Each structure stands twice: as C-alpha cells, then as structure tokens.
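Re: your question from the hallway

Yes, I did run it. Sequences:
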Amino acid sequence: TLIRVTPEQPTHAVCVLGTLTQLDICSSAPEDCTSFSINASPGVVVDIAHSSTWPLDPGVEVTLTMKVASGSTGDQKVQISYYGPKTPPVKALLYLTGVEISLCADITRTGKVKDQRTWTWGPCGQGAILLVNCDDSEDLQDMSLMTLSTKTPKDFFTNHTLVLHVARSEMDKVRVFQATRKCSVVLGPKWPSHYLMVPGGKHNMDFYVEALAFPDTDFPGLITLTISLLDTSNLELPEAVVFQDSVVFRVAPWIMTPNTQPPQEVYACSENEDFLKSVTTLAMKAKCKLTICMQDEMEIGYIQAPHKTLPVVFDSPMGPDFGYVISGLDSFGNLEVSPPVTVRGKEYPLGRILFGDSCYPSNDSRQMHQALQDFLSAQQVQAPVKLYSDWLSVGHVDEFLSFVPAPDRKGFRLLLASPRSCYKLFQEQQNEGHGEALLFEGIKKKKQQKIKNILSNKTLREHNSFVERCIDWNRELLKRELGLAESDIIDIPQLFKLKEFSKAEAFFPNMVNMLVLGKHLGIPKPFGPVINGRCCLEEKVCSLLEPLGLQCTFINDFFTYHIRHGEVHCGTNVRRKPFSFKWWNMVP
Amino acid sequence: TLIRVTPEQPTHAVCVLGTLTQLDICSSAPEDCTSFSINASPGVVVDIAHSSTWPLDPGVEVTLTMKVASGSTGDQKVQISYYGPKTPPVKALLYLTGVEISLCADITRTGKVKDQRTWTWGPCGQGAILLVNCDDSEDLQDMSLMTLSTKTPKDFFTNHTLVLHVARSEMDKVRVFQATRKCSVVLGPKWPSHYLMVPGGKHNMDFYVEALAFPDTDFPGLITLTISLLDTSNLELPEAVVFQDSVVFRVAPWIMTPNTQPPQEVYACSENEDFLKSVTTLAMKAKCKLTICMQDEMEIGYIQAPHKTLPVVFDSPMGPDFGYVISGLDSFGNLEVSPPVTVRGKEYPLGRILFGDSCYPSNDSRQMHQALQDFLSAQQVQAPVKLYSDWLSVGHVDEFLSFVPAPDRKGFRLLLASPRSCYKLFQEQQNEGHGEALLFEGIKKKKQQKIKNILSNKTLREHNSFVERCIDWNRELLKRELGLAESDIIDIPQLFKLKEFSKAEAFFPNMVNMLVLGKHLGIPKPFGPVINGRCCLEEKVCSLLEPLGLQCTFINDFFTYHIRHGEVHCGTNVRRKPFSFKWWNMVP
Ligand SMILES: Cc1c(-c2cc3ccccc3n2Cc2ccc(F)cc2)nc2cc(C(=O)N3CCC[C@@H](N)C3)ccn12
Ligand SMILES: Cc1c(-c2cc3ccccc3n2Cc2ccc(F)cc2)nc2cc(C(=O)N3CCC[C@@H](N)C3)ccn12
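Structure:
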C-alpha cells in the first residue's frame, strides 16, 4: 500500500476509499532533475507533507486520497513532473482505480450498523457484540448483522477477489452465514476462509454471525473477522494481498440476576402439598407469573446484546424456559450474586457472584471445581468473590446468606444467619417466664424441645458459638469485597447442629434461604416456640424486615428429602428482570 | 475479625498487629442503659467513629489497634461501661492477646525484603518477582526470599497454629523450601498446604521460592502464597481461621534481545572453513567472546528479577550456555524482536517480537503453531507482531528483515530486502557499459550470469516484481506496529527466484540476514558482478551502512546445506546484553 512510480513505464494501482496511500516519488527518479511537482485528476487528493513546486528530498511524504470510487479501471490519473536547472520536465504517470470495500457490524452498540480493530469497554468504546447460539428471518433475530458494502468498476473482480476469514484459533467459536434475498455457512469450524462471489458496481452483502462458545479459560471472548482484497492479474504467480479490513466481535458473557432484581416468572415444577397454594398466593400478591410441570440444580441468568436480551439457564453438573449451557460445592446452591455495589471506587453495577470454598486446601477440604471458578471469572462483569462454606455439611453460601430489597442506604440488605440473634431472643424469653415454650410444636415426626433445655445445653451453645465464628469470617469477607457497613447487614436468628465430621446443618428450617419476589418474602416457617400465640422467631424476622416494607409470609414444607442423590432441596426458582445497565458499558 | 463483648462473661480475643478490629459493643448490651464509654490498657488504641462518653447507637463504630505484641496471653484489657439515666455502670471485659504475623518478600523490587494483595506493573507498582527454575547457598541465589516474622507469647502456639498454602490451581507452578540454618520442600505440586512448626516469642523463618512454569495460555503468571492463623483451643470442634495474609508473586517472562543490544558472546559451534577466521577477526574487532565445539534452531533470551538476571535459551521444536526451556514457521529462524520502539503513544521498551505467518489461512497456507504464538503473547512485555512470510519457501522473517544500530533518529535502521534497489543498480551499470559483468565469478559449482542477461529476463523481472509487493506489504505492517517513517528504513539490494509452488528463495546469498556485533557487521558475501574490481553489490551495502558508522565485512560460506532435515542454515548465534530497563516497570 505504498505506490512506486517510474518515469520508465506508467504504473497502475487500486485504492480503497479511506486509506492513506504513500507515493515513492524518489526511488526511480532522474538525478539530472533536482525538484518535482504533482498534478492529478479532480477526484484524487494529493497531500505533500515536508499550482506548487517541491524538492526531490527523499524526506518529503506525498500521500494519495480518492474521493468517489471509479466507474472505470484507471479513470483517475496522477502525473509526476521531475524538472531541474536546465533539464526539461520528465513525466511519470500513475493510473489509479478507486474502490469502496467497507465491512461493518454494530460497533457503536445501538442496534444499527455503522476507532480501530480493537474492542473497548464502556460508554464510549467500540465493538460489536455476538450472542452464543444456545441450541431464518426469526433465527437471524438472535444473530448479529455484518454487511460488506462495495462500489467498484463493472470490470473490477475480473482480476481482484475478496475472501472473508477467521483465525484457525477462533473458527470453532464462531459461525457466519451469507444471506441471499435464505442463508448458507461461509465461515465456522473446519472453514476459516471463504472466497466471496461479488459483482462490480454498488453491491452490499448481508452476513449473519452467531458465537458457539461462551468466554472461558481458553477463550478471552473476541472473534475477529477479516476481509482481504487479492490481486489475481499475474495469472502464473500467486494472489497478492492489496487490502485488509476487519471487525472485532466480543461474545456476550453469561450474567446472573440478584434477588434485588424484580421477578418475572416463578418455577415451582416441584410432589407438593398446600405449599403450591401459599406460593400462588404470594405469586398473585407479587403480580408475578407461576408455572408447574430440580430448581436447586440450575440458575436462570441472561446473555445481552443491543439487538437481543435472551434468558439463558446454566445447569449445574427437560421442558422449562429457552436457552441452556463432582463435589458438593459444584452445585448452584453454592452460587449467589450480590446486588449492584461500589467498593473503594471500583464499581460493580451487575453485582459480584459469590461462591462457597474452603479457607485453605487440606485433604479434608472441598472446593468448587476450578473449571467453574475460571468460567465465572471469564465473564468478567460480576468479578466472583470466594466465601467460606466448607464448614457446612452441604457446603452452599445460600445456607447462611441472602439479599432483600431495601428502600434507603444502598437499596438492599445482606441477610446473614446468626446463632447469637436467636440465643439473645430464646433467653430474653426465659427471663419473662416462657422458658417452658416448646420448639417443634405441631410436627408429625420430631422430638420437641423447650427454650430452657436448649439454653441449658452446653454442647449446643459451643457448636453454635463455633458457627458464629465461621459466618463472622464471611461477614468481614462480604464487608470488604462488597464494600458494606454494619448498617447494611441484618442478622436473622438461626441455630445449627454439627452432624458427621463436625459439619453444620440448620437446627430449624433455614429462614435466611427465602423466596424474594420484590417486597414479598416467602420465608421458610421455622416452626419455633410459640409465645402468646406467635412463633417468637416469626416475630423477630418480621420486626427486622417489615420496617423495610417487606411482606413476610412463613411457608410450611419449604424443603424436601428425595430418593436418589438423597439430599434436602428447595423446589422453587425465579427468572428475574435483566439489569438496565449494559454489561458492555462497565470496565473490568 | 469482629469481637463481640457480653457483660455476661469476659471475652478473650487474639489481635494481629496492623489489623483494624471492630467491636460489637451493642448486640449483647443492656437496654436499661442508654450510653457507654471505653477504657483500655495503655498498649491498646480504641478509635470511636460516629476521658469520653458515647451513645449506644448501633451506628457508632469502635475499632481496636494494638501497638506492641503481647508477652503474655491477655496482658492487654478493654473495659466497656454501659451507664444510663439512673442505672449504675455495668462492665463488659475484653482480654486481648496481640501478636505480629508478617509474611514478606521483595514486593518493592529492590533485592531487599519489605499496597494490597494485587500485583501492579510499573515504576510505583508492588509485587515480588519469581524466576523459573530452568534445570544450597548457591542454588538459593536464583530463588526468591520470603520470610515469616512473628512476635507472640511463649505460650501462643499451644492453641494457635500457622499454615502456608497455595491454590491447588497454582501448586504445580511453584516450589517453596523452608531454610534451617539447609532446606526442605513445604509447598509445591502434590502439596498445596503446610502446617509450620513455629515457636513463641520473636521467631523469623526464611523460605526460598522458585517458579516451575513460564506464563502461557493456561497461566497468567501469578502465584499467591497465603499464611493462615488457626485457633485450635476448642479441641472437639474443627480449626477456626482468625487471620490470613498473602504475597502475590509474578513469574518473570522470557525476553529476547534485538540486534541493537550489545553482543556478549558469539557461538560458532558450527564442519567449517576460513569462515571461522573471518568470524574470530570480526569477534576480536568487536571486542566480543567467541566459542566453538544448530544456531538457527534456538534463541538465547533472558529472565530477570531484582536479585538475578540469567540467560535462558529457548530451543525450537547439548553443551552451550546455562538455562533451557511441526511446521517450517515453528523455527526461530521465524522469530526476531524489534529494538525499543514507541507507537502512537504506547511504549515498547524491550521492543516487539516479530514472527512470520500467512495473510489468511487457506489449505495451501502455513502458520506458526498456535501453541508458540500464545506463549510469546503470555510474556506480554514484547507484544508479538504478525508479519507475512508464507510467500517464501523456507518461510522465515529473518530472510527479508533485520535491524542494525544507528547513531541518529530512533538509534536503529530496519533493513528490508529489496529487488528494486538491486535492479536500479544492475541497470545503472549497463548504462555505463559493464552490462557484460558476470554475477557468480569465482564459484566452484554455479552457472555464471551477466547483468544484461539478468536484466533482459522478463520471467525474472516479474518474479522479483511480485516479491517486491510481498515485502512492501510487511514494509507497511512494520511501519504501523513499530511506528516507523521511511527515514528509519534502508533497502538492501537483494533479488529472488521462485522455486516449487511459486515460493521464494534469495537469488544470491541473502545479505540482509547478517551478523550484527554492535557497529561491526558480518554480511554474507553476495559473490556479485565485479566492476572496476569491487562487487557492485558490496559497494551499495557499504554506501548505505558505512555512513551510519557500521564496519561491513563480507564473509564467504555464510550458509550451508546438511544431510538429515536437509536445509540451508546459518552457523552463528549471539548472546546479547539484557535491557537496562526492567520488564516489570512497563505497562501492557
Ligand atoms: C437441615 C435443614 C433445615 C431443617 C432443619 C429441620 C429440623 C426439623 C424439621 C425440619 C428441618 N429443616 C427443614 C427440612 C425439611 C424437610 C427435610 F426433609 C429436611 C429439612 N433447613 C435447611 C435448609 C438448608 C438450605 O438452606 N439448603 C438446603 C440444602 C441445599 C442448599 N442449597 C440450601 C439446608 C439444610 N436445612
Ligand atoms: C537460497 C539462499 C541463499 C543463497 C542463494 C545462492 C545462490 C548461489 C550460491 C549460494 C547461494 N546462497 C547461499 C547458499 C550457500 C550455500 C548453500 F548450500 C545454499 C545457499 N542465501 C540464503 C539465505 C537464506 C536465509 O536468510 N536463511 C536461510 C534459511 C533459514 C532462514 N532462517 C535464514 C535463505 C535462503 N538463501
């Protein structure tokens, strides 16, 4: 893309509109002559940087611009006169053929097709987004548009030829279809390059692009597609590259919705009892859709481009929504996301994903499978945070933490399970004489217990006092990585037993692990000591939550054992409104 | 690491120096009382943020600091008085044991052991560097020092215990030895955690750390080592984490030395003839060491930490230096690095690595193995640049480009092979009547050729005219990615034949692919047409280079065919001075 002119022969060149072209005016000059000048046909725009006159100084820098594409091979002309003290002007002729080759996608991020060949984050960055095909004129409504607009002479592709191509390293992560009034595969796995059939004149060409893989440990998540122009005139010699333009795509990451995000649909596909009633009552009250046909073993996120926002469900290691993609800590039981937070400056507008882990890796210690941890980080926009959960028998963060919408402060509360909270309440009672009150009243199969005989236990007080620490550790972890003050955290009274290998389960139905449908909470009925005909525990949950403006509804049968994989399981799940904020306008 | 005080019992806590500790003054308070005050023993430093008085407002934020470590369990005391309108002061006692746990490496990057747990690039970033063990009290001179300084009561580790640990994801990329006046493996592959034997009082402990893997596609190149403090007092319950500190290490990348870098040793281990003489003459003249015992199939780089700079030789897919680590484009023939460049602002002080590739991937097209391309990028500091070389039969960038030191401008010249340069010279001659001059004079086995009969060839003029394009394409690629002006580029006259499958070899010994020893150039003797007893070609090389102050010495037998892997091969190699500039002070 530098042109060398000889006064010997006339040189012919092609010129893509929008390309600074340098002129070697010097290499083949006569030394009889000292200086030169540059006349050109009206449609060409010479810019000499150091009528007119100039010295033959090799330091001078003549550049060519073409205004409009040619209608004819060589219909624009550049003449170099080489004159000097007494050595008449020698001419050197350049016949230019201008052509428009512009390859475009939605780099502006506005659902209309319009910088560098680099993808930039944020409100003023450039880069088209690609959604993952998660298994025409309706299928193409998910795929991203990319058009090749070309103006050239009728004759042009007689001895020129375009080829679209993708790095053999990215071909298996993209598929490209060429539209035809009706589509066909040009690029994808096993095909990294394609020769285009393009006619002369003004022809624009529509391609539809889907991604095949999410970002991950082996894919930073960019697919560059390049158009190359090739000279095929010398018939015996191989193709000569004249020109390359490209578009960088960024594959949209998988994003999760916190409980603070308004609900859109509740899934209760889970046997059943009067639970389904108390759910449909809270679903009606929540002005939210309810369905029936496990929920604990999968998580409904979304993927988002300017042109489409689609719900995608990630299934933990089937007729629900539309879009799908071993340790006890590999479950999505062990996967929450915070609400939008800011932390010491850095901003996290789609929140931060939280997942349970150990403190340090021993031979008696469990972690989430590295493969998952890396995948979540790959998505970048929800900077995962590693919490301590291995102390629990099951090992899930949803066992001791939750979020609920608040009106004031940061517009949310962190709910942490709290043995102390429950103890201070249980004894405050003994002091008022209700020490005789029986926890587990109205229960088919459970040995009932009095406040007194629970408080008077020394073995329990410690077990719970140890759990206090385990949570109080995550309390700080959360306070730091989500940038929280105590005035953002609410302690829900909750006790624990330590079963096999000193591991922890909730002592009574785990009230923190609730159903948030905006301001309408489905809390697991603790079935606790009743005092003056009101479950002491229900009272304190409602006293900590109703002030926030949250409708607390305690539901029986909230969890359930099963036969195979035998495990306690929540039966509900909630598709929620995707963030207004566009993932591609943040800055990791 | 929040402490809750009850007026019921006295609470005991440990406190690591340098840790803001929060006091829950409120959860277990009496409601008979309205306000509180905080007296403490001289060595503790309370900071109440909202003698003294304060309201019991849960919004208040009492924080604990300890000055010096304790000599005795609980030798520092905090008392919380809860007083009110007519409700005498109730006390709540806190017995604090202060301890120093500080884990340190060379985070300052100064070869002395002294922010966050994050590695930062540049002149004011923090992060210790780790060199790769590339196969005592001399072995440890390569390894990085990390010390655990602890001051505690004599009694302290009776019911506390430290453990050093590395993410199971990074254990196979690090090895950690514990010194003993004498060393042993604490952490590495198959061991992610270690219990430390630490005594009470002031004890500091030396660990030596080596990396086992360079950064690569599956390793961003950081090794975090964490120290955890564990409470082992409750004997029946599991260990409780009280405290964690960590050091992030960055594994030093493999770096290459351009020709602009002063030579330190020449390797001519390569049979031989009078070549070895003409080399030792240029080596003596270059005040540079020469050795004898292939050079084309490996590349001497370096790895660099504050405490050690070591030469490492990367071997392309043996008794030379010290430190080691299929397509025709996988060779290091196809691997140069530019000199230090700046490009449109962005700065590249260790230069940029250049490697040959195709334009677009066809079924008749060769690329460097993705595995290598990714490795070079992994090292980050020399942002690889992809050039067009597949047009050449062998396919190596060193076939058409080189660099040499200059005094002025950017302190270097890009040397590009140039058919035009050679043609303008070859004909300028015919014009002066030496058209009869025979190229390949004094050659045992080669059919000689006259300027006239080379110029009068139409088949050659084109072949060479096609190569011109191929290079003129890299000319622009180089001009853009290395940010160059024509006044940085020198054209060396060089012609080509196109052998099998229209591929290119040098028509005469490839003069651009020379031996740079600072200002002393070993150029391959072109064996070209002699005019007035001086090889026309030698004249023009020297006319383009001697002005720069470069001593041009044309060497016979510079390349050589072999038996197995039968291929043309340069026999020399050059270990060069590593950059003064520290890779860890740049910013990718
Ligand atoms: C022992 C236990 C309890 C609980 C303690 C208890 C005591 C008596 C009666 C019911 C009791 N119940 C209710 C229940 C219901 C039916 C049944 F057969 C088993 C458990 N409540 C929870 C909640 C959780 C929790 O939060 N998770 C469930 C596991 C998967 C995690 N992802 C989420 C974990 C353990 N729990
Ligand atoms: C055909 C050729 C020539 C050349 C052309 C030529 C013509 C006549 C005589 C000698 C000639 N010679 C000299 C030579 C020497 C001995 C021998 F048996 C083969 C080639 N000179 C080069 C230099 C290069 C080059 O730059 N490379 C070598 C390959 C590996 C690359 N990494 C670097 C490549 C091909 N060449």
